[PDB]
Amino acid sequence: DVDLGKLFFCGFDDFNEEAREVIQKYRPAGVLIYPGVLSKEYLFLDFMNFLSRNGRFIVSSDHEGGQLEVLKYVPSFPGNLAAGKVDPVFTGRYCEMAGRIMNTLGFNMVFAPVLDLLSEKGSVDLRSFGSDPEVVASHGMEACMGYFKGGVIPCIKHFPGHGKTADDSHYLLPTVNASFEELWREDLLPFRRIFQSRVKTAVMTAHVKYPAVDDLPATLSKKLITEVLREKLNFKGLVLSDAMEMKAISENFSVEEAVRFFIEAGGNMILLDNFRDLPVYYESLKKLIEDGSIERGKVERSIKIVDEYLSALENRFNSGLIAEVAERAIECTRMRKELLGREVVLLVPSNTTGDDYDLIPEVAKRFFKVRDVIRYDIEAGPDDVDGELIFDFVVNASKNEQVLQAHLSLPSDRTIYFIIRNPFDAKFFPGRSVVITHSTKPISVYKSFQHLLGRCS
Amino acid sequence: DLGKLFFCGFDDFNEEAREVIQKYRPAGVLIYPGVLSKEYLFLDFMNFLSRNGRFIVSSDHEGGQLEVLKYVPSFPGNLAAGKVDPVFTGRYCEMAGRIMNTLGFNMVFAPVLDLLSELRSFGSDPEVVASHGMEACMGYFKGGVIPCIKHFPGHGKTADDSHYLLPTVNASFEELWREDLLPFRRIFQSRVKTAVMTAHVKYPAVDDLPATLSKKLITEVLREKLNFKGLVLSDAMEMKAISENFSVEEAVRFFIEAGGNMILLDNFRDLPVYYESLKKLIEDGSIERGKVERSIKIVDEYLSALENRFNSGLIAEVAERAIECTRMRKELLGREVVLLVPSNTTGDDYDLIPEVAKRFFKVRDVIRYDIEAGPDDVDGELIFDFVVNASKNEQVLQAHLSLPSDRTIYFIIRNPFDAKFFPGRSVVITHSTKPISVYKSFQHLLGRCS
Ligand SMILES: [Zn+2]
Ligand SMILES: [Zn+2]
Ligand SMILES: [Zn+2]
Ligand SMILES: [Zn+2]
Ligand SMILES: [Zn+2]
Ligand SMILES: [Zn+2]
Ligand SMILES: [Zn+2]
Ligand SMILES: [Zn+2]
Ligand SMILES: [Zn+2]
Ligand SMILES: [Zn+2]
Ligand SMILES: [Zn+2]
Ligand SMILES: [Zn+2]
Ligand SMILES: [Zn+2]
Ligand SMILES: [Zn+2]
Ligand SMILES: [Zn+2]
Ligand SMILES: [Zn+2]
Ligand SMILES: [Zn+2]
C-alpha cells in the first residue's frame, strides 16, 4: 500500500514545493509535464533533476507533432493529417527522431500516436492520419515502432476511437452511434494492428459513450475495456484513462464512481490532469479498496503491470544534469536569514545575454517579494537607491571607478551583489554580501535564489 | 575536387546556396542563425543536403553564451562547468551531441579551450580546462558528433577580438606550452577524435604571422611537436584580423602551406573567389600539390567516419509530398499578391504566412480576415486566400467564393474537406498550417503545379 501511487499518472502545470510534497508522499508512478513547466526551461530542468533523485517514474508529454506540440526541442512536424498522405515510412522516421530527442531529455513515454479516424462530423482536425482505416493503421504502426526505436514507449489513443463524434470531451460527454461491427471493422482496426505486433505500448481510453454497445463512457466501461480490449483484442499491457477531471467524466460521475468503474473495468492507471487532485483521488481509491468495492486482485495486477513498464526504462539520460551544474557552480557569502522575508528592489542590467536579463524579475518573483524592478546602464551603474532589501545583479563592475562606486554606494547592510558575468569582480566587494553564479542563465539565477534561502543561510 | 578544402557558413538557404553547393561541392556546411531561426529553412536545407552527397555539418552551439540550436536545452556555460566535476561536462555534451546528431549535424565547433584571463572558457587553471575539455570532446563524440577544439594555440591572454583587429598575445613559447597549450596537448595525447580550429592571433614572441597563417605554429608546433595528424580548420578567413592585413591569395597560400586542411568561410557567397584563388595557386606552383592531397585525404576520412540515418529534413519531404494542387497559370505568378490570412498555436502559424510568401512572391498587401465572417471583398493582380473554416455557414462560404476566380488561389490549410466547396477554382491543399507546409506549397505552385 506504499505502492498505491503506481495507479496514478499526474500532470504538472508547475514545479514547486507542493509538487515535491505530493510526489514524495504519494509516489505517483507517472509524471506528465505540461506547458506550464515546459515553457520555463529552468523549471523543466530542475523538475527533471528532482525526478532522478526520487525513484523511478514514467515521464511523459503530449507531444504528438503538428497541432499539439509542447516540446521546443523537437523540430516541428506538419502533423498526422499530412503524414497520412505520405509513405508511412516517413511517420516511422519522424517518431524515431522525436522519440530519440525525448529520450535524451529524460522522457520515457509519449502520449501518441492518435489513432482516431477522421470523419466529416469531427473537427481534432489535423491530429488524425486519415479516414481510411487502413491508412491509419499502417501509419499508427510505423509511429509506435519509431517511438520505440527512439527510446520512448508509445501510448495509443483514444480507445476505441472517437473520430465519429462532433462533440469534445473537454466540454461534455460525447456520443458515437456506430454498431460494434462498425467499430471493429473501422475505428478499432488501427488499435488491432498494434496489438497484433510485438511493440510495447500503452493504451489511453476515450471519455466517450457508445450507446449501440454500452451505457458507460469507454473509460468507465467493463464491456469496452475487459470484454473488448483485454479479452477479444488480447491486450495485456498498461491501460490509462484520459484525464478524470475532464467534464465528460466529472459532470456525470463522482470521483468515487469514476475511480471504481475504471479500475473495475480493467484499467491500470488513473490520469489526473492536476497533481493537486491526487490526494482526493488517492484517498478515494484507498477507501474503495477497504470497503471492498474494488477487488484487491485488480489493484495488485495493475501494480504488477506498472512495475514491468517502470523496469523497462533503464535510461542514462536526464537533462536535469544541467540543473546540477548550475546548482553546484554557485558560491555565496554568509547571509542573514532575517533579511530574506523582506520586500526586494531588483537592479538589473538594462539590455543572447540580454534575454537572460529580462527573465531575472520573473525568477525572483518565485522566491521573493518584489517592490520595484529598476533597469540600470552597465556603463554608468545603478542610481543610488534604498529599500528593505536590494539585489544588485552586477555586470561589468570594473569598467571604471565611477561605475565601481555606483555599485558600492548601496547600503551594504541590505544589498546582495549577484556577480553574474565576470567573477573576478567579486574581489571589488569586500565585506559585502556576494553571490557568484558564473552564469547569466535563468537556471543559475534560479539556483542562486535557492541557495540564498537554503544553504547560504 | 577542391571543394573538400572548404567549409562554408550559410546565413540563408536559396538557389544561390544551392548553385554554389552543387557547382563547388564544399565538404563542410556550417549553419548560421540566419537559417536556424527559420525552422522551415533549416528543415528544407537539411533535406537538400541529404540529396547532394556527403557533408560535414556543423554549428557554433557551445552552450552558455553562444547558443544557436533551440533543440538543445540551454547550459550555464563553460565557466560554470569548470567549477564542477568534469563528468557533468561530459554528460552535457553527450546530450547535446545526441540531439544534434538526431537533427543531422555530425560536427560541433566546441569546446573552447582558451584560458580565462583578467564565460566561454572553463577557467584559468590549465589543468581544469584540460579535464573538462577531454570530457567535452568525449561526450560530443559519444553523442554522435565530431568535436572541434578552438582556438589553437589558445588566446585567452588577449583582450582584443579578431572580428575587429588582429589581436596580440605576448607570452613566450615556454609559457604557451606550459599553460595555453596544455589542454590542447592533453587531448592529443589522450587520442580522442577531434578537429582543431586555429586562432587569428599573433604571437610576437614566437612568430610574425597569425596562427591561422603560421607555418611555425601549425607545422612545427601543432603537427610536429604536438603530433596532431587530424583535421585542421581555419577560423573564418573573412574576419578582419585576416582580411584587413592579408589578401585572399596570401591567406589561402599561407594557410595551406602552413599545414592547414579546410578553409572556413563565414559566407558561402565568397566561395568562388577563394576557390579560384586556391585553384590558381595550385596551378602556378605557390602551393605544394602534396599538401592539397594530404588535406583531401584527411577530409575523406572524416566524411566516411561520419554516417547517420538521422536527418530532420524528412519533415520537409512529408510537407512536400502532402501538397495537392490544381493546375495553375504560370503567368499569374509573376504578379503582385494580396494575402488573405486568418487573423490571430495555429495562430502563430498564420502570423508567419506573410514572411514565407515574401520569399516567393511580390506582396502588395496583407489583410487579416475574421474567419467567422470570411474575407471582405477584395481585388488585386493575384489573390491568395488562406482558407480556414469555409463551411461554418453559407455567408462565410460565399465570402470566400465571391473572390475573383480568375485570379484567386485558395490555400485550404486546415480542413481539407472544404475543397469540395470550391469547384472550378484554383485550389491548393496543404493538410497543414505549419510554415514548412506553406513554404512547400509555394514551391509547388511555382514548380509542379505550373
Ligand atoms: Zn482522440
Ligand atoms: Zn478537447
Ligand atoms: Zn462506416
Ligand atoms: Zn487529448
Ligand atoms: Zn492516505
Ligand atoms: Zn492479494
Ligand atoms: Zn544536487
Ligand atoms: Zn553550493
Ligand atoms: Zn569562481
Ligand atoms: Zn577562442
Ligand atoms: Zn569576436
Ligand atoms: Zn602565466
Ligand atoms: Zn572565433
Ligand atoms: Zn601528385
Ligand atoms: Zn522530394
Ligand atoms: Zn507534389
Ligand atoms: Zn487530402
| A181 Cα distance to chain centroid | 37
> What amino acid is encoded at A113 in this protein?
P
Assess B419–A contact: CB distance below 8 Å, yes or no. no
Q: Do the bridges between strand A389-394 and strand A415-419 make them parallel or antiparallel, or are there none, so unpaired?
A: parallel
Residue in this structure with the C-alpha cell 512495475, named with its chain if needed = A307
Catalytic residue among B44, B60, B180, B235: B235
How many CA atoms within 13 Å lie on the side-chain side of A434? 18
The answer to whether B263 and B255 are in contact (CB under 8 A) is yes
Assess B64–A contact: CB distance below 8 Å, yes or no. yes
Catalytic residue among A87, A125, A170, A413: A170
The answer to whether A320 and A45 are in contact (CB under 8 A) is yes
The reply to whether A14 belongs to the active site is: no
The 10 Å Cβ neighbour count of residue A279 is: 13
Cα(B353)–Cα(B359) distance, integer angstroms: 10
Cα(B184)–Cα(B200) distance, integer angstroms: 17
| B285 Cα distance to chain centroid | 34
- CATH fit for domain A1-329, picks 3.20.20.300, 3.40.225.10, 3.40.710.10, 3.40.50.300: 3.20.20.300
Cα(A167)–Cα(A210) distance, integer angstroms: 13
| DSSP code, position B217 | I
Return the domain boundaries, chain A: 1-329, 330-457
In the structure grid, which three cell numbers stand for residue B149, read together? Answer: 577544439
Q: Name, in order, each residue with C-beta under 8 angstroms of A22's C-beta and a sequence gap of 6 or more.
A: A10, A28, A275, A276, A278, A279
The answer to whether B326 and A90 are in contact (CB under 8 A) is no
3-state secondary structure chain A: CCCHHHHEEEEECCCCHHHHHHHHHHCCCEEEECHHHHCCHHHHHHHHHHHCCCCCCEEEECCCECCECCCCCCCCCCCHHHHHCCCCHHHHHHHHHHHHHHHHHCCCEECCCECCCCCCCCCCCCCCCCCCHHHHHHHHHHHHHHHHHHCCEEEEEEECCCCCCCCCCCCCCCECCCCHHHHHHCCCHHHHHHHCCCCCCEEEECCCECCCCCCCEHHHCHHHHHHHHHHHCCCCCCEECCCCCCHHHHCCCCHHHHHHHHHHCCCCEEEECCHHHHHHHHHHHHHHHHCCCCCHHHHHHHHHHHHHHHHHCCCCCCCCHHHHHHHHCCEECCCCHHHCCCEEEEEEECCCHHHHHHHHHHHHHHHCEEEEEEEEECCCECCCCCCCEEEEEECCCCCCHHHHHHHHCCCCCCEEEEECCCHHHHHHCCCCEEEECCCCCHHHHHHHHHHHHCCCC
How many CA atoms within 13 Å lie on the side-chain side of A202? 32
Cα(B201)–Cα(B38) distance, integer angstroms: 33
Q: Which of residues 279-318 of B touch A (CB under 8 A)?
A: 310, 312, 314-315, 317-318
Give, to the nearest 10 degrees, the angle between helix B314-321 and helix B39-50: 100
| DSSP code, position B270 | G
Deposited resolution, Å? 2.5
The 10 Å Cβ neighbour count of residue B257 is: 17
Assess A87–B contact: CB distance below 8 Å, yes or no. yes
Task: State residue A209 phi and psi, 5-degree precision.
Answer: -90, 135
Assess B83–A contact: CB distance below 8 Å, yes or no. yes
B382's enclosing H/E stretch is: strand B382-387
| DSSP code, position B332 | G
Q: Name, in order, each residue with C-beta under 8 angstroms of B244's C-beta and a sequence gap of 6 or more.
A: B165, B166
For A296-307, letters b (16+ CB in 10 Å) and e give eebbeebbebbe
Cα(B264)–Cα(B272) distance, integer angstroms: 13
Task: State residue B44 phi and psi, 5-degree precision.
Answer: -65, -40
CA of B290 to the centre of ligand 14 (A): 6
Angle at B218 between CA B245 and CA B132, to 5 degrees: 105
Beta bridge pairs of residue B385? B340, B410
Strands (E), B101-245: 107-108, 148-152, 195-198, 232-233
The answer to whether B76 and A441 are in contact (CB under 8 A) is yes
Cα(B163)–Cα(B45) distance, integer angstroms: 27
How buried is residue A430: exposed, middle or buried, by Cβ count under 10 Å (0-12/13-18/19+)? exposed
The end-to-end CA distance of chain A, in Å, is 38
Helices (H), B182-336: 182-190, 215, 240-243, 248-257, 271-283, 289-305, 314-321
3-class DSSP state of B309: coil
Cα(B440)–Cα(A39) distance, integer angstroms: 29
How buried is residue A438: exposed, middle or buried, by Cβ count under 10 Å (0-12/13-18/19+)? buried
| Structure obtained using | X-ray
Q: Which of B237, B427, B232, B403 is nearest to B325 (CA)?
A: B427
3-class DSSP state of B233: strand
The answer to whether A299 and A329 are in contact (CB under 8 A) is no
Q: Which of A228, A182, A184, A186 is nearest to A205 (CA)?
A: A228
The answer to whether A332 and A456 are in contact (CB under 8 A) is yes
Across the A/B interface, how many CB contacts are shorter than 8 Å?
170
Q: Do the bridges between strand A331-332 and strand A433-436 make them parallel or antiparallel, or are there none, so unpaired?
A: antiparallel
Q: Which long-range contacts (CB under 8 A, 24 or more apart) does B329-332 make?
A: B329/B450, B330/B450, B332/B381, B332/B382, B332/B407
Cα(A71)–Cα(A74) distance, integer angstroms: 6
- CATH fit for domain B1-322, picks 3.20.20.300, 3.40.50.300, 3.30.70.2860, 3.30.70.2190: 3.20.20.300
Assess A451–B contact: CB distance below 8 Å, yes or no. no
The answer to whether A139 and A129 are in contact (CB under 8 A) is yes
Q: Name, in order, each residue with C-beta under 8 angstroms of B275's C-beta and a sequence gap of 6 or more.
A: B2, B3, B6, B24
Q: Which of A135, A121, A210 is nearest to A166 (CA)?
A: A121
> What amino acid is encoded at B18 in this protein?
R
- Closest Cβ–Cβ partner in A66, A322, A437 for B432: A66
Angle at A399 between CA A393 and CA A400, to 5 degrees: 115
Question: Is there a contact between A94 and B434 if contact means CB atoms under 8 Å apart?
Answer: no
Strands (E), B105-213: 107-108, 148-152, 195-198
Angle at A283 between CA A282 and CA A287, to 5 degrees: 120
Question: Which residue of B36, B38, B119, B436 to mutate against A (max A Cβ within 10 Å)?
Answer: B119
Angle at B167 between CA B165 and CA B170, to 5 degrees: 160
Beta bridge pairs of residue A32? A11, A60
The end-to-end CA distance of chain B, in Å, is 36
- Closest Cβ–Cβ partner in A325, A331, A424 for B76: A325
In the structure grid, which three cell numbers stand for residue A142, read together? Answer: 510505423
In the structure grid, which three cell numbers stand for residue A82, read together? Answer: 499530412
The answer to whether A27 and A55 are in contact (CB under 8 A) is yes
Cα(A190)–Cα(A129) distance, integer angstroms: 11
The answer to whether A204 and A111 are in contact (CB under 8 A) is yes
The 10 Å Cβ neighbour count of residue B81 is: 32
| DSSP code, position B245 | T
3-class DSSP state of B369: strand
B368's enclosing H/E stretch is: strand B362-369
Cα(A274)–Cα(A340) distance, integer angstroms: 31
**Closest listed ligand to the CA of A295:** 6
Chain breaks in chain A (C to N over 2.5 A) after: 123, 351
Sort out which chain A residues have CB atoms less than 8 A from B308's CB and list them: none
Distances from the Cα of B101 to the Cα of B58, B232, B311, B373, angstroms: 10, 22, 8, 46
| DSSP code, position B114 | P
Cα(A232)–Cα(A429) distance, integer angstroms: 74
Give, to the nearest 10 degrees, the angle between helix A41-51 and helix A17-26: 20
Residue in this structure with the C-alpha cell 471492498, named with its chain if needed = A292
Residue in this structure with the C-alpha cell 586542411, named with its chain if needed = B261
3-class DSSP state of B224: helix
The answer to whether B428 and B322 are in contact (CB under 8 A) is no
Cα(B111)–Cα(B147) distance, integer angstroms: 7
The reply to whether A170 belongs to the active site is: yes
The answer to whether A392 and A347 are in contact (CB under 8 A) is yes
Cα(A302)–Cα(A284) distance, integer angstroms: 17
Angle at B91 between CA B86 and CA B97, to 5 degrees: 125
